[PDB]
Design a protein around this nucleic acid. Structure first.
Lengths: 150, 90, 365
RNA sequence: AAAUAGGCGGCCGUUCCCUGGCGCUUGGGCCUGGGCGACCGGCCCAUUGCCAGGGACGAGGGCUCGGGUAGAAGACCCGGUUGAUAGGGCGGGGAUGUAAGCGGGAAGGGUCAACCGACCCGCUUAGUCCGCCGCCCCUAAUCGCCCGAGGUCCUGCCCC
RNA sequence: CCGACACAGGUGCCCCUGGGUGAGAAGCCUAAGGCGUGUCGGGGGAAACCCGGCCGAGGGAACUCGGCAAACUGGCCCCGUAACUUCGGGAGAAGGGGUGCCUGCGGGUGCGUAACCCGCAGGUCGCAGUGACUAGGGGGGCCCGACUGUUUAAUAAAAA
RNA sequence: UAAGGUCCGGUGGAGCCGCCGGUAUCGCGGAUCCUGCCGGGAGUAGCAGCGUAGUCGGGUGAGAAUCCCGACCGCCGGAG
RNA sequence: CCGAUAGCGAACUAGUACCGUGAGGGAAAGCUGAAAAGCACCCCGGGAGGGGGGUGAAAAGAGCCUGAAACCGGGCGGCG
């Protein structure tokens, strides 16, 4: 669904993604980082991540992963898959908003939040006659973008 | 510099001890690719099957110490680049 | 337990083994004052040679030929940027004030053909510009307000303690840096006013090996040693080998400790930084001072140095130099600073200008 | 990061306007009765200050690029055309030991002729090679991004 | 196929005479034929540490329960060969020498100069001629059990 | 006292209380409890060790280090 | 009497799937709505995926009545 307030006629535009086959933890680091920016900066940010230029800092989940230089937190990594996938969500808010009579580029991103969805589960082998879960997480991520201009 | 052509010698020497020895030959090629791109100020480049053969000739293990290469600069259309370089052995 | 003792491996006296706080060496400990003369001087390690000398250097003969390995060091000339004043507090020595010299001569500098734009380098010390220490913003004004501040300090009179000098390099032939390394050297005499007079003359002056230091003395050397990176328990502390044939073990400490005590001591061998550590090594004999190198017109007190083909990993030596006995702590191309000895041997006398029979002329390669 | 939480030198930030409301709100000088004084009362000044509505400017530093005297990542150190950092070319210094070709010799065997020949010598201190140094800007050190403020909430020392 | 797994496992035959090699259904290389899905890539000249493996002066088991591990010998030809003895064996004892390429001959079998094989002399290069791969270290006393075989399918292969 | 009762708001959209007398496969914190669902571990280990294999152009496609074509470089040789 | 972790092995695709050479062993798996109107038409999207509008009411939108806890994101308050 959607997990935040709306005033979609002239001050909000929304879109959501369901069952994206992506890491939920890597969705946590991008949503937080991206949050509070305008759409255009958010496109720019995603494009840099894919190039393998600006790192996404690891923060809340962070363990056993190498640091990355510069201002921003010690560890970080690049979630290419998620950046491509989220770019599509954002593109959908952008096409929609224009029909709705909002100008997308100026609208700031109030809210982006990730939801750990259903779990694709099975088995892959281990030793001693035993099989262990081998799972892919399927993730929903919502975006609600809001006008701000003078 | 714009329009043609540079003849350049690319030193392969990084290839030894930057990566190991069989798989010097895949590494040489990345060096040839970088050197040319760098010098060009360009994209990854296209390099002729003749450079490959040259690196490869002795085998995966023994690539040669230098390799002389001829590069050109050209444009394109549609939208995009400067940024395209055709290079072959000389 | 066999009831057999094992003497400790590694020291805790050059511990903790961890990276230097700066590329510049540091100093607290200053050697004996007895003369109104410059204390401490600097160079870059060029490489190494070996030398034949006539003993001199008192020991097991005092007349037969002796082999002594040598470190050839290119010293830059230095330029005293400022006078640092100290006042003595309650808790330790604190810097009262400083005079700097913003003021600009054009540097003995060269470089560069192409040619169309020589583009002038005429150096107000554009090397100060390349030094990331900042500068007023009215050169004349600043120097004078400080000079007046000095005059006060000299007047009061005994409020002021000793004088030390902020001194910086001049790269005017060295290609391994182009940014002044900035340091402190003390100016000793025996009483403040004599140090105050000397430091004031000194400031505008490009100075030598000759000014600071004399041949035939023993000297300390202060430096940050060459960085290995991280190295093993084997390397850092020393470890012995074990029993009949061990595949599994070999480079191993076994015990870190007992079960109670329920902690790890800091004296047990582990991996971590080795090198890039600060060391002062005592009593290295000053073989030689000269300037150039390559040719000198006189045939005694050198005939002039430099192997042909340079040295591996060092540029051309052409400027004032010093050749010091034995090992020098550091890597090739690193800044080393030289410290007079605090006291030298006394069972072995220093003897001035030691006799230099012959100098190497072969490359290190 | 010694909580007695240091010392110095330099560099920085160190703002406007209409309209309405307020000012011993803020700040100084003078007279006189009272006070040691601050203070009350009388006289004099403010391009000013304050609240509400809109509004400027941007020192440092990283990321970037060429390499390392540095290095598990990250960091460190140096250079970036105000330049010789890296590579080319050339030349200097080093490593190996005589290159390919050709010419002659060469145990012999053959119509002892055209020749078949391991090997030897000359050419040739050759040839091949360098993680080093110098000359030299030819080539590549471009292009471009950011984060980081806004003499400080309130108090007291000296003036305003 | 079977082992839950597309498991380095392990289940029959046939091609066992491909070429070079060399005693060879050996190794290596290579042909017909097959593949690069023994299915995750890239980076750090890659530091410590760990597995496989290479090399170590001088010394030559000082290590350790113990020469364990590892090393050495090494193919082939020739010479020579002890104690002991069930006379069969020990024995490939031990130890010593040689071995390449070229040039020219001889012998054997044959038929007439084929196909191979075994010797001989001269010339000559290297540090090294089984130069690689293949490829026993040897010797002596003692205990036990005759031997070959079998054994705790899966911590004991032994003297049982 | 309390075991537990009762009222309001949101949600939900058909059944439900009280009293009195009865009755029981009648109240749960543990049982290396049983079953079911879920997090940390981790974005770590594995995706290496055995004779260590790919690579450049080009084709196709929304997406190509591992699909195909050629060239080039290899392993295998009673066996891959 | 029980009421879907209960009661028959089994409210159903059960003596099924599956295990075991075999004898034998053996689960889980119920609920749309008044009507299927079971998603047309329109915008977007590589898109069989996904979002807005379209139902009395979609926390009635396809194992779809209700829709807890553990737990996971975001936000609010507070601490930091």
């Amino acid at each position: 669904g959607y997990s935040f307030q709306n005033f979609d006629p002239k001050r909000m535009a929304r879109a959501s993604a369901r069952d994206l086959r992506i890491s939920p933890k890597l969705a946590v680091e991008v949503c937080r980082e991206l949050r509070g920016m305008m759409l255009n900066d958010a496109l720019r940010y995603l494009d840099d991540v894919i190039a393998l230029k600006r790192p996404v800092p690891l923060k809340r989940y962070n363990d056993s992963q190498g640091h990355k230089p510069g201002k921003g937190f010690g560890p970080g990594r690049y979630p290419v898959k998620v950046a491509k996938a989220i770019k599509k969500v954002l593109l959908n808010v952008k096409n929609n908003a224009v029909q709705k009579g909002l100008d997308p580029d100026k609208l700031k991103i109030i809210h982006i939040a990730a939801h750990k969805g259903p779990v694709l589960r099975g088995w892959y082998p281990r030793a001693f006659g035993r099989a262990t879960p081998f799972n892919e997480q399927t993730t929903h991520i919502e975006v609600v973008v809001e006008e701000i201009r003078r | 510099k714009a329009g043609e052509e540079v003849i350049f010698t690319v030193p392969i020497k990084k290839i030894k001890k930057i990566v190991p020895r069989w798989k010097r030959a895949p590494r040489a090629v990345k060096f040839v690719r970088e050197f040319v791109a760098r010098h060009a100020k360009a994209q990854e480049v296209i390099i002729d099957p003749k450079v490959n053969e040259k690196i490869w000739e002795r085998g995966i293990e023994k690539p040669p110490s230098k390799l002389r290469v001829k590069v050109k600069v050209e444009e394109e259309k549609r939208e995009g680049e400067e940024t395209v370089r055709i290079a072959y052995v000389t | 337990m066999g009831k057999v003792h094992r003497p400790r491996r590694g020291s805790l006296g050059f511990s903790p083994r961890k990276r230097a706080k700066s590329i510049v060496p540091r100093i607290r400990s200053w050697p004996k004052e007895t003369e109104v003369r410059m204390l401490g001087f600097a160079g870059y390690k060029a490489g190494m040679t070996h030398i034949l000398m006539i003993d001199d250097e008192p020991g097991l003969t005092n007349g037969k030929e002796i082999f002594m390995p040598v470190t050839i060091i290119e010293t830059p000339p230095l330029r005293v940027f400022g006078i640092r004043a100290y006042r003595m507090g309650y808790l330790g020595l604190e810097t009262a004030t400083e005079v700097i010299v913003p003021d600009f001569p054009l540097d003995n500098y060269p470089a560069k053909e192409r040619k169309g734009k020589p583009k002038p380098k005429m150096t107000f010390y554009k090397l100060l510009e390349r030094r990331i220490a900042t500068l007023p913003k009215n050169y004349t004004q600043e120097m004078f307000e400080q000079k007046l501040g000095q005059l006060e300090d000299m007047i009061k009179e005994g409020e002021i303690v000793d004088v030390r000098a902020i001194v910086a390099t001049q790269p005017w032939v060295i290609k391994l840096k182009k940014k002044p390394e900035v340091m402190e050297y003390a100016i000793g005499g025996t009483s403040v006013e004599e140090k105050f007079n000397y430091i004031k003359e000194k400031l505008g002056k490009e100075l030598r090996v000759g000014e600071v230091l004399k041949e035939g003395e023993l000297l300390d050397v202060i430096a940050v040693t060459k960085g290995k990176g991280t190295q093993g328990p084997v390397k850092r502390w020393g470890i012995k080998l074990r029993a009949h044939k061990d595949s599994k073990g070999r480079r191993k400490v076994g015990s870190i400790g007992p079960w109670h005590p329920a902690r790890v001591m800091w004296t047990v061998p582990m991996a971590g930084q080795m090198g890039f550590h600060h060391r002062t090594e005592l009593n290295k004999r000053l073989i030689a001072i000269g300037e150039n190198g390559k040719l000198k017109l006189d045939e005694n007190t050198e005939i002039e140095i430099t192997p042909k083909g340079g040295f591996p990993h060092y540029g051309i030596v052409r400027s004032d130099f010093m050749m010091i006995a034995g090992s020098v702590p550091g890597a090739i191309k690193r800044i080393i600073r030289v410290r007079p000895a605090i006291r030298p041997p006394k069972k072995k006398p220093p003897v001035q200008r030691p006799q230099i029979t012959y100098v190497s002329v072969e490359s290190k390669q």
